[PDB]
Design a protein around this ligand. Sequence first.
Ligand code: PCD
Ligand code: PCD
Ligand code: HCI
Ligand code: HCI
Ligand code: FES
Ligand code: FES
Ligand code: FES
Ligand code: FES
Ligand code: CL
Ligand code: CL
Ligand code: CL
Ligand code: CL
Ligand code: MG
Ligand code: MG
Ligand code: MG
Ligand code: MG
Ligand code: MG
Ligand code: MG
Ligand code: MG
Ligand code: MG
Lengths: 907, 907
Amino acid sequence: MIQKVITVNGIEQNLFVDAEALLSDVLRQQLGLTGVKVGCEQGQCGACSVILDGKVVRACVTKMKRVADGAQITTIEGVGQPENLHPLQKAWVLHGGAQCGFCSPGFIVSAKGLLDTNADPSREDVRDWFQKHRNACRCTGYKPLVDAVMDAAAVINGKKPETDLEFKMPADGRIWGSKYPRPTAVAKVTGTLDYGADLGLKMPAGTLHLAMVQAKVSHANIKGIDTSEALTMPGVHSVITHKDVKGKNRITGLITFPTNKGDGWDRPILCDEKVFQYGDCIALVCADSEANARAAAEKVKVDLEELPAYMSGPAAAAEDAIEIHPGTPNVYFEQPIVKGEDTGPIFASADVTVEGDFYVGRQPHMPIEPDVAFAYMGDDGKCYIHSKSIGVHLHLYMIAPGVGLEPDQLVLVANPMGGTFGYKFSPTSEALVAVAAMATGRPVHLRYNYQQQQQYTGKRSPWEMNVKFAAKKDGTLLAMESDWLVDHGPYSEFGDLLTLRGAQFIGAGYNIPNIRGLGRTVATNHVWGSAFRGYGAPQSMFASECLMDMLAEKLGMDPLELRYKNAYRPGDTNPTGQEPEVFSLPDMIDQLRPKYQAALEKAQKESTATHKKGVGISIGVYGSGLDGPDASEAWAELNADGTITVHTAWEDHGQGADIGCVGTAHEALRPMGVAPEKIKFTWPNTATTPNSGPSGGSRQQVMTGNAIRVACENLLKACEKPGGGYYTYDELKAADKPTKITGNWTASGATHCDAVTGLGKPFVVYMYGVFMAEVTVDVATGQTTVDGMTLMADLGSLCNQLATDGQIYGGLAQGIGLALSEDFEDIKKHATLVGAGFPFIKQIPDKLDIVYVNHPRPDGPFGASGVGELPLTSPHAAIINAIKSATGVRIYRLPAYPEKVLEALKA
Amino acid sequence: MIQKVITVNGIEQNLFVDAEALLSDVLRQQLGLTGVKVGCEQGQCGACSVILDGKVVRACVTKMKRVADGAQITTIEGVGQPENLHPLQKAWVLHGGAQCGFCSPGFIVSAKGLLDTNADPSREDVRDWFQKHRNACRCTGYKPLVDAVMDAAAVINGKKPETDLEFKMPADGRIWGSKYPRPTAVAKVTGTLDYGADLGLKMPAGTLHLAMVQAKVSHANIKGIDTSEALTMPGVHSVITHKDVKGKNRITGLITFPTNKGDGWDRPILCDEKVFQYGDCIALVCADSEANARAAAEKVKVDLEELPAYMSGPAAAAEDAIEIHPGTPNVYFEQPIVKGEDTGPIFASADVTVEGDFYVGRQPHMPIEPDVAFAYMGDDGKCYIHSKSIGVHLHLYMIAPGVGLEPDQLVLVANPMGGTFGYKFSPTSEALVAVAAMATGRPVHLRYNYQQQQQYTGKRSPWEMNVKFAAKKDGTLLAMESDWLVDHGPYSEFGDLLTLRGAQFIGAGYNIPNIRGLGRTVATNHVWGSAFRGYGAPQSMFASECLMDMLAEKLGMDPLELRYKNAYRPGDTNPTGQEPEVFSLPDMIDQLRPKYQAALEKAQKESTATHKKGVGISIGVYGSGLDGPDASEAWAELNADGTITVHTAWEDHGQGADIGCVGTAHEALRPMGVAPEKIKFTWPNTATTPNSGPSGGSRQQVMTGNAIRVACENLLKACEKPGGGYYTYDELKAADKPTKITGNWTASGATHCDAVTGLGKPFVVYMYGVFMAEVTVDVATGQTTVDGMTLMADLGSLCNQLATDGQIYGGLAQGIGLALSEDFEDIKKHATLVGAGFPFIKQIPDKLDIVYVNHPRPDGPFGASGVGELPLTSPHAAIINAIKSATGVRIYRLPAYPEKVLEALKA
Ligand code: PCD
Ligand code: PCD
Ligand SMILES: O=C(O)CCc1ccccc1
Ligand SMILES: O=C(O)CCc1ccccc1
Ligand code: FES
Ligand code: FES
Ligand code: FES
Ligand code: FES
Ligand SMILES: [Cl-]
Ligand SMILES: [Cl-]
Ligand SMILES: [Cl-]
Ligand SMILES: [Cl-]
Ligand SMILES: [Mg+2]
Ligand SMILES: [Mg+2]
Ligand SMILES: [Mg+2]
Ligand SMILES: [Mg+2]
Ligand SMILES: [Mg+2]
Ligand SMILES: [Mg+2]
Ligand SMILES: [Mg+2]
Ligand SMILES: [Mg+2]
């Protein structure tokens, strides 16, 4: 051990450390500076950036031996605090740079280091700095972050007053549609919002820390577990196995379709008889620390009989493949789509037909924060779980039978969380921590490392697709055929539903009167499927939007004009036979057209012999809602102090549940003149908030926003005075009148898609958009650079523009990754950010352009649709279409790795 | 477990707690708010004061079940931080209220609660508030704290500007003699100075926490130790016993006198053969937490054979008493005093003689911070100990042979510490933590609780005394006889030296030409003796100053005038035959006289039938130095940045080592124009600071102040330019000239007292003072209230008046405790602050008056003497003399408990 006397955030610290200890651990654990966020633990994400003697360093890869006596360290806590915010912090708030907020401390500290060395950076200097310092963000697409740095720099430089970093209320006092900052932003930019790992450090000494004993093969029969050596190791309390599970030891898929061949009870909590994928949790070590638990987990010996593993859909779907779940066929679900007339004769007589085989793979969500959860037995006898769940009520019912609790004896709560992008539509750690809390009686905390985040959370499910179009010479679509095979890994939850998305979204955007297709879901031993932002549309619309460009090419037609010819107009129906609710695609195309023509001309002018430029288009469509007559509930409560609490379970991945609640409620409460800062939101909790439903399907703004609107309307009625005006809280309580008022809303017009035909009215609101990608391909290397992305977006009406702009930039950035670099195919190689192709800032162009073309929705609150998934529906199709424009090469199977593009260029 | 969402220091906290957990633990451990200080753990000291929903509560006795959802908590961290100080914090700094600083957070938080309820308190309101909230201070005597509150209130009230709470540099730029604030004050008032328990919370996860397995009888032969059950308990690493000690397993007294009958090697590190007092450490449990170590220590079984214990000096000194240390007589040392002619014939022919039997007991130091230390093996192979040692070099040599290390393989460092008042002149925990670090190889931390602080740290040693005077009718002293028996408990360190103090200080102040006396030191089984501020003078001068009043009464003379007749004047010698160095007692008496006469008149006027007022006087004298030719060393270094570091081992109990260094160096550096904020001090460290010696014997200002002066003079010479002016650092390094310059100083005129006669010149500087106490006795109850204390003090020259005023107020307050309430006699009953008679604020009058009558010392730096022990030399004699004035009752045996006074009143 060594004494080191240094200065941390301006205060001398008399530190006692191991010279080998990591600075991140010292700062977080020894000094309580949980504003230093740790994600990857491998120097790749920047979340743990600190200033050490004027240099920005990653604390997770800086050992204390590198910190000299007398060193100066700055963490986010030393940059500024609430009510003493630094210009960078104020600018982050103003520009909406904290979505999940997990990266915000690191970017802000890194940015302070930049500005301390270069006071007046260009935007490119900012981008170069964040690239060099590895500052990674999965939510924002980086542009808002650069905007904030530039604004802060101008203030620090004396070029504008610091008061200009403070939001200015609009003339009219309307926050709906504005750039009002989100309530959580101050806590995020100051490092004072505690995420699950932070909470773990702040839990009491009795708390047990868990480590998973995981399968290191993809498929096996388990013969036994030997915990004997582990129990002798430092700090070990016990080891938990399936024998300690008090219920069924299975998670239920809950809404398994009747025509699914499986019962939906396939997924274990703790493996008993089999390993179904690499990473499956077989046991939990409970210890006094994460480090001691992990060391002991390495010593638990699992005796198993390895089985041949099926590592892709086609392999598992073979007629003679062995059933992974004995008694259920590996191909466990099929969804037909049968619209209009038989397609065979139409293809035979059509002027033009095209066909393609396409693939979209196992995209990894890659939030900067790896999965984390904790649980405890309450003094009320209930088991409480605090996790990254984005569907607390849903998950309660998915896990309760398996853990052995009645629903009223379990409570799920959503912690502040550092992004999910859908992986938290699935249970991950909740049942594990519940079982351990119940078995031990003690609080328990489980933190995944980044390799566990990659290997042992769910993934976008790969689809192998064949799609065909028949059309007239003038470009009018006549018919479509489709076939898709969904590799869902071993656990069925929502896999049938995902397969149904292909019936809904392959070919969406256009009038297609005649469709015949079939989706199939197959169990494999690769990673199980969890929703990933877009949930079936990125697969579906990659196929159809690429195929539209192939049709245009075969016709000799411009691909934007082919889309214009076919885009939904009054009278048309979508693939499930439903009329669109608004008709904004022609408007968006007409507004994009001159920008597209200008981009084509620029691409021609700026292309060189080696660097070929191209422009690509695609359309995106997705529902806002869960299928059928989805619903939500909110409670609007006048508090004694005159504030209003709007109680919901709107789960915040980081997208903005806080501001969505406040903005929607503000607009609904306008007759009573309620200031936005007087409106409070509630963190999701199954015991104390209503069942607003999950934050999936781009649904909360529509469903929960309508419920909030209704609840607030009902609170206004409850407050209205005879003669005009409104009663105060004191007046209402004196009259023994209610102050907490419910509202509900249901998408009553919607119907589930039919099991035989696929037809129905599954959503009452959709999101519509048109993408344009501008790219450069180096034809010597195959490397593609995305130089610009544009989204024409119809969101109906904006609740909050900082929120929606940020949603769109983040989705576009994920689309660049999906197109060019990302996958989870290689269990080890793809288990790091860099290994799996995470998009760092230079991969994302600074030119991300949005044009809102909003057509108010009949059923949306104040006309709003959702936004969350729209920007990932098909940006990757536009990008691949742009590579084709540039070079003549079509990549059919994502991602467009440089060697893959090269091979195609040279063929 | 329960979730509680509350606000702490203005920031929402999502807390996860046990409802039974203490708020102090939650705040310190879970949230890292080590500004919440914990001393007593029993609700008696206020150090842990926090504001909870507008009320000041003691966090150590507040369980989390009492903290509601939505509660608001404020700790010192929420009051203000460095560079954002609250008016209360600024006022504390300005008024010198942070001495050790351990109580400062709690007083400041408590004071904020006061001012939030009563914006314009009277001084009495302030005192009532601190009494009610149990805010305890052992350093300051409370008056500076009240001063600070009143000043802060005036600023908060708009009656004076906040800038007036900032120190104003004197016209001349001289900080010597000024009220310049001490360097450590900001850290203390903000809770950002880490004391040993704070450091323990900030040590890494590898750290083992220790608990002592202690004797629960006073005297025994040990037969065996059974650790088997303890080793099975949660979190236990090992148990350490004497078998793990690598050296002699004994502490050496190091300077044991040749005529001591014992070898000075009597004290074990870990008991092997015997228990010598209740509390002796027999084993150390090492565990993952203090709580788990303590729980397991309760299960270690010690097999012993209890022996009859000698619980007082007279009992142990009996001719037939059994030797506690077999082979050494219990009476192990005697010191004669033989000055002038035989006293028997002089007593026989004297006009007047008086005699008395007096007792001063086992005063407990009662710092607010209980003892704490830690140790580790460095990467350099040395063992490092960080403790409350106030003599790091001394303790290194006292413990090294016992722990089995050569001196260069051990390093002792003084942590910031919450007071000692002398108990840390002894080793307490240093050898224990070293043995555990060496045995385990791991960092180890040991925190005593308050009962262990009381039972198992050393004490003022009781003296049983008989003193006699012979005098002329005119009051001239002719002769003195003296006999004293010192109960030193079982461990000999410095017990012979303490006994020698009686030869030096019984009768000090007056010319006494003929003295015959004998002191004896006896081992007992009550608590071992450790220095307590005054070290022999409180005992000695209680006897002689009470006896002077008895002589005055027998002569019918005024007691101030009797002192005036006899006080040292040129030509006189002190008891050891040495001439005083200055002669300030007549001056001080002449300046006190009219105040004394006025106080007598007030006492007569304001007395009532039931409440009798009186006034008492005493003189105090003590040396500044260790006996003989004491010495110190300092290094003055010009740093590259133009600051100057003055390297010393001046150990800071809280008295002001920091400001003593800075002020002394500033004065010495004046020719070079060095600003005080450019002067740095060093925390004591045996490896990297010079052997300046211990902070005992009121010596550092004289010895180390002279060494600092010399070092700085030598640095000036090293910097002087040819032609005038001074070279800069850069100029010196360019010339390859030295920048770090040594200075030494020795008290060359001093000689050790003779073993046969007691005569010698033991100190070259003494401190001189005259006390006046004003008291009221309720003759129905025997309760005494001290209404005022005055000290006339000759300190030569003041280095810093905030420091010296505070020293005097604190010593006067300890004198009130010694006189009226304090003891450590009953092992259990006296093991709490309240049980042992700690003086809370109402016991200490607001009227504490100082008059400096400074006579520059020939050998002191800039004329200074020490101050530390002067105010405790005899205030308790003045108080008992005042009770006698009031009531006619003399209390001979301290303390003057109410029942004791009543019995005397009624006899
Ligand atoms: N018009 C409009 C719309 C919307 N908004 C906004 O925006 C947001 C969003 O919304 P939405 O769309 O409704 O959604 P939500 O439901 O809330 O959420 C969810 C989503 O969200 C997204 N985004 C995001 N972001 C972030 N940051 N992070 C994340 O993680 C995430 N995730 C993702 C996903 S995947 Mo799934 O689960 O697969 O199905 S679906 C999803 C919010 O804040 C709201 O309020 C506005 O403002 N306006
Ligand atoms: N003239 C003069 C003198 C002095 N000063 C200051 O005052 C202080 C003190 O000093 P001194 O006297 O020199 O002393 P020191 O050595 O430093 O110290 C020690 C002491 O100190 C005291 N005080 C105190 N305070 C407090 N707060 N706390 C404590 O704990 C204490 N302790 C106590 C004791 S006990 Mo022995 O150890 O028994 O012998 S001794 C003693 C310092 O700060 C200094 O600087 C000045 O200013 N001036
Ligand atoms: O409706 C449910 O209960 C879950 C529906 C769902 C699950 C995963 C992605 C989209 C919709
Ligand atoms: O001189 C030493 O080595 C210790 C001298 C001492 C010890 C305890 C109190 C006063 C002086
Ligand atoms: S770079 Fe340190 S946690 Fe990712
Ligand atoms: S805001 Fe950057 S990772 Fe979420
Ligand atoms: S009153 Fe709480 S530590 Fe003393
Ligand atoms: S300053 Fe109050 S206890 Fe030391
Ligand atoms: Cl391909
Ligand atoms: Cl490649
Ligand atoms: Cl008595
Ligand atoms: Cl009593
Ligand atoms: Mg500022
Ligand atoms: Mg038509
Ligand atoms: Mg590959
Ligand atoms: Mg190749
Ligand atoms: Mg202020
Ligand atoms: Mg004379
Ligand atoms: Mg008694
Ligand atoms: Mg009695």
